[PDB]
Amino acid sequence: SHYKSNVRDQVFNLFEVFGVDKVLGADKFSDLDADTAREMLTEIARLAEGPIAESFVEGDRNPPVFDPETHTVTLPEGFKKSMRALFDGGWDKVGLAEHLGGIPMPRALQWALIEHILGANPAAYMYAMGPGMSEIFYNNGTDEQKKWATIAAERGWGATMVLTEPDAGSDVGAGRTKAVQQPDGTWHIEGVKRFITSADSDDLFENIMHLVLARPEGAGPGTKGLSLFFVPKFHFDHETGEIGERNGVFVTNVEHKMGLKVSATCELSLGQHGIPAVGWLVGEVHNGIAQMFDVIEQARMMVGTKAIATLSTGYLNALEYAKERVQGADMTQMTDKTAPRVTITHHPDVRRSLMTQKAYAEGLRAIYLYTATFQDAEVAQAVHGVDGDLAARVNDLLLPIVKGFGSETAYAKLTESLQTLGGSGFLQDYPIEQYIRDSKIDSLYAGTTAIQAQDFFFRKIIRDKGQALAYVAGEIEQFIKNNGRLKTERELLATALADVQGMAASLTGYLMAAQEDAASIYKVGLGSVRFLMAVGDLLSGWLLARQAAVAIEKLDAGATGADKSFYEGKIAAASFFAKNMLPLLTSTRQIIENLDNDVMELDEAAF
Amino acid sequence: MSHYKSNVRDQVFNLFEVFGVDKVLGADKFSDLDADTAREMLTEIARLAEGPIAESFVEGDRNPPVFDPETHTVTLPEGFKKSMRALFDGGWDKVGLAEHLGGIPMPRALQWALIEHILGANPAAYMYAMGPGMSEIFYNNGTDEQKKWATIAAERGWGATMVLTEPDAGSDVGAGRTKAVQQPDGTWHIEGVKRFITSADSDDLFENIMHLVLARPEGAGPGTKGLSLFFVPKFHFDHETGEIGERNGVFVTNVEHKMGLKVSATCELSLGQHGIPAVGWLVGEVHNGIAQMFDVIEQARMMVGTKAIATLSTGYLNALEYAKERVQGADMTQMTDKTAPRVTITHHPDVRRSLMTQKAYAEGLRAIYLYTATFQDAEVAQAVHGVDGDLAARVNDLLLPIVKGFGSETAYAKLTESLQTLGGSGFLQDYPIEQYIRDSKIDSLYAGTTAIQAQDFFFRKIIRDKGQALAYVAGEIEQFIKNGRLKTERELLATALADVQGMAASLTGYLMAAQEDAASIYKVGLGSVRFLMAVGDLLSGWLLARQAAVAIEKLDAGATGADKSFYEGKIAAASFFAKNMLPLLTSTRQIIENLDNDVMELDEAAF
Ligand SMILES: CCCCCCCCCCCCCCCC(=O)SCCNC(=O)CCNC(=O)[C@H](O)C(C)(C)COP(=O)(O)OP(=O)(O)OC[C@H]1O[C@@H](n2cnc3c(N)ncnc32)[C@H](O)[C@@H]1OP(=O)(O)O
Ligand SMILES: CCCCCCCCCCCCCCCC(=O)SCCNC(=O)CCNC(=O)[C@H](O)C(C)(C)COP(=O)(O)OP(=O)(O)OC[C@H]1O[C@@H](n2cnc3c(N)ncnc32)[C@H](O)[C@@H]1OP(=O)(O)O
Ligand SMILES: Cc1cc2nc3c(=O)[nH]c(=O)nc-3n(C[C@H](O)[C@H](O)[C@H](O)COP(=O)(O)OP(=O)(O)OC[C@H]3O[C@@H](n4cnc5c(N)ncnc54)[C@H](O)[C@@H]3O)c2cc1C
């Protein structure tokens, strides 16, 4: 039972902070009320803590085994039993479109439900993303393809996203897998893809939809020349869904990884074994990179939310350990060798550690749920008063924060969780070292942190003309401008907001200097990740302070018992974060204001 | 070649061109070891480390030790035992051993540079080889009779352990309850269970193991002052001839399953619980256990810090070699051109940022442990610093928790950049970086957690010392700042020195004000680790800048070729470190000056 959930904080964000319940029972969510949403969260949290978390250790210690002659993978039995628990509850259809068998709901509620699976056994959610992919295929498909997507969703087929090649990882546009058009309008896909998650999955599903980027013969170069293809593991009857002949797409290797071991990560060979890999052009148009980014956006949201879910259960494990571990005397009695021994939560450095973990875990939860409130036009209208166009641009702005800042932060603060256990934290008997291993990948797949920071600056700020950024900054400034019990926190936030504004101005400055001296663009690259992390810190501190303001109101109204303790912890967290994390942004702004190209001019031989 | 990439060039640069250790080679204690021989020794052990020692790095992780409950022994993988035999056959387990025990006299600074290579290539191999060094400590603390046993133990190459920790006594060594009962013949029977004992069994590597066990004589007082230290051998032996006799009652009962460092058997150790007494001999025949054991702990803390630093160094050189060859993307100056030539990733600004961060910290940390070691011999300290024996010992004691605490935390943090440089391939066991990360996570925990390092540094190495060692080091930094091409670095170092000075003053004020307000002491606890880390960053910046001043002198004298590249890299690293790492200490000073007890007052239930 490694997984420790936090429904209370989820509901606090969804209802008391963001007001997502304002849309429940109205319009698209007419048949889902606030009580039902709360019961779903409790239900999936309990299932996550039980049957899903049950095989978390098994999947790591008894990982999938590859048979290279059948080109298939065997998963451990306990993990497949967790997968069936997921399917039997319908949790592979959270927020799926109603016409595909789904229950309509705000994306903020959907991601909070998913948080529990990602905290308990994140590879289980990844294997279960087939219906979500069926829905993207549906939205992008022809009328006839929409009929296959409906079948795939109803039969619960698995799915993969197939981009990476050995020479084309960050540079997707360099891929050489090719597509050869047939007279009847299908295509034959030829190439080897690498690092494909779930490319085989034992007997979990009756079929797998591979969504494959490939370059049609004679198409131009880069990502703009790529097309997206529906390549099923098995041919099937397009009218009934009955499974047919094996299609020419075969796993030829399974990687040995640091963590996330139960997710089979596969070399995938298309058309290499003398059987054609038939693919159907998605939507029967050539628009591959744009179509595939519908998938990439969801994957990046998932990876950020995965890292955040894992830091949260890492923190709650550390806290429960610390509450019970007796070691040493209180610091006020450190010289008295007969003083009473105390539990380690009495020690300042452990409280520092735990509050650092708490504030980042909770601030990150607020960030991904805040981000999700812009993913439905109706939620964004009802809770923020912003129209659909700006909501989409704000969601797109925040996705690289959820992914890049979420993955980096969670991994770094799990170091504090492990440390809280002392030497025991190094044992596989406790789950934190596996949290660390399982979460290292989140800075890498779905685009590395450097790729997230480059997306954030060039596409989500500059190409956006700063409109989404200016929107969020205006909300932060409005909080600062508005009791004086948060006076010191608002002053710290004001300094941090000006620090980030100063970073944006410097980086924009280097970009405009590149009109005259091309090399000046390198300074944007030097400072981009630090800027992305600074915006994440500023958002964490703002959202914690918002949570603190709500908590003050609820305490003033007369909260008691466990509610009172919860609200007290929000005040302490927002105050701790403002005073210990935000001021570092000032030094980071001055560092960014002084970047230079010395490190770019250095001979490679001098490293 | 192997996973292990060594850096003898940087070691020799530090030892000779920066600290002038070659000035003592050939004279007095080191009469028979000249500079040429020292360099050939470093080259020889580097090749041993890259060859047979590194050969079983992966194997000890993938095929880890197995506990046998039928015999209460541990079995080690055959390839790792072959590596151990290569270490012994070359005499490398007698590096810096006293001449009368069979060693080769050498400066401690040379000794630790030699040991760095084993710690980089397979650090558990050095840990299993620490027997002869423990015999020397037993010799130094022993009676005349006991010195004869310690001589035999060195000559026969017996293994050794340091046996302190119990389930309820880890950081708080003084809570130990293992008991010592004196026998009529003047031996003792030791009774208790110890936990997490490194090398507590080692298969058939040795013919005997010396366990150095802390235990509380019946009737003694509480805390660490009531502990005594006992020589408890695995087998009884003839005190004159060394011939091995009957088994003594000290048995391993389990082996821990760990995140990393798997080939180091970490064992529960039972004394007197299996039907025969564990006979022990009181060391020095005096009751002075925690003082005696700290002779061992001091060495273990130097070892752990040097291990973490060795591991970052080979992590960096692996990532750098990968980056030079990995082609991905276009030059940022050609971002918008999708037919622009592809480049190797060292052309990308974020990768150069990541590599220079790894390089500056790895080399700064190497400078710190070598500098620390130049204070471990009175003669070296006199010859290269002009300091007498008493001040030397105090400065070495000041620097040890920096080597250990700042070393372990920094190495694990910056290996994250090493892994990131490989992209998705960094997450594969095919490359050594993910094992580096798992193997080095323990360095912040054993030999005293980081918080214990930070408390030792401030309470014992500064306050109890009345700032003598600290003022000495600060005066050497100020002298460098005092002194054109290094004007900016010296200005940034002056800011960092004043920041650390401000931190020390604030924390000393919180401590002294505890006399009138007891809870004031908690702010010392809240800030101690950040203070320790700030001193390590300041030392790193200063030593790198000193290196850059030597590099400038050598370039002015006409260095060419590979020498010139090396020197250019030192100037670049010192400058990058001063401009990108040092300024953050200003925000950390201001954070420390505003610490408060809110987080101490918060109800535990609010977390
Ligand atoms: C809910 C269910 C989801 C279904 C899931 C089913 C199976 C999967 C389950 C398992 C999960 C596994 C998680 C790990 C997965 C992976 O790693 S998949 C591989 C991920 N690969 C990447 O993320 C690529 C990283 N590299 C880049 O992003 C790089 O910056 C790119 C490739 C974009 C650079 O290429 P360029 O050619 O230089 O890009 P350019 O800027 O000019 O844009 C071209 C074109 O791309 C579109 N685009 C680009 N960026 C975005 C963003 N951020 N969002 C949307 N669209 C984007 C645009 O079409 C753009 O053209 P324009 O004319 O509009 O500019
Ligand atoms: C090269 C040869 C080496 C041989 C090695 C052989 C075996 C091979 C394998 C070993 C490698 C594996 C590495 C991992 C091994 C381990 O983890 S062993 C377990 C390590 N345990 C610790 O480090 C303890 C951590 N806790 C503390 O340090 C804690 O702060 C202590 C225990 C010090 C607090 O106890 P107190 O009683 O409160 O301490 P106090 O401050 O009052 O001092 C009491 C007494 O202790 C001595 N002392 C304390 N601190 C030091 C230091 N830094 N240096 C020397 N001596 C110290 C003093 O005697 C002191 O008395 P005073 O009157 O002088 O104050
Ligand atoms: C467990 C796992 C599962 C995966 N699953 C899938 C999957 O299901 N589907 C799929 O299509 N792919 C998948 N991948 C591939 C994954 O997305 C890539 O590994 C990732 O995009 C990084 O690419 P790469 O490994 O080639 O690294 P590289 O692109 O070679 O990057 C190496 C280094 O160079 C840096 N770099 C590269 N280009 C630039 C640039 N222009 N500017 C600055 N820095 C740059 C990177 O940040 C990194 O630090 C998976 C990978 C892993 C590890």
Ligand SMILES: Cc1cc2nc3c(=O)[nH]c(=O)nc-3n(C[C@H](O)[C@H](O)[C@H](O)COP(=O)(O)OP(=O)(O)OC[C@H]3O[C@@H](n4cnc5c(N)ncnc54)[C@H](O)[C@@H]3O)c2cc1C
């Ligand atoms: C791989 C491994 C090998 C080991 N080898 C040996 C060996 O050979 N010999 C041996 O004797 N021991 C050995 N140990 C034990 C090791 O030194 C201890 O784990 C370590 O000292 C921490 O003690 P603990 O595990 O009981 O943690 P705890 O002392 O319970 O610490 C728990 C947490 O509380 C914090 N904390 C505790 N006390 C205080 C305080 N007073 N103030 C502030 N914070 C505090 C710690 O920093 C940590 O975050 C080994 C351990 C491991 C993991």
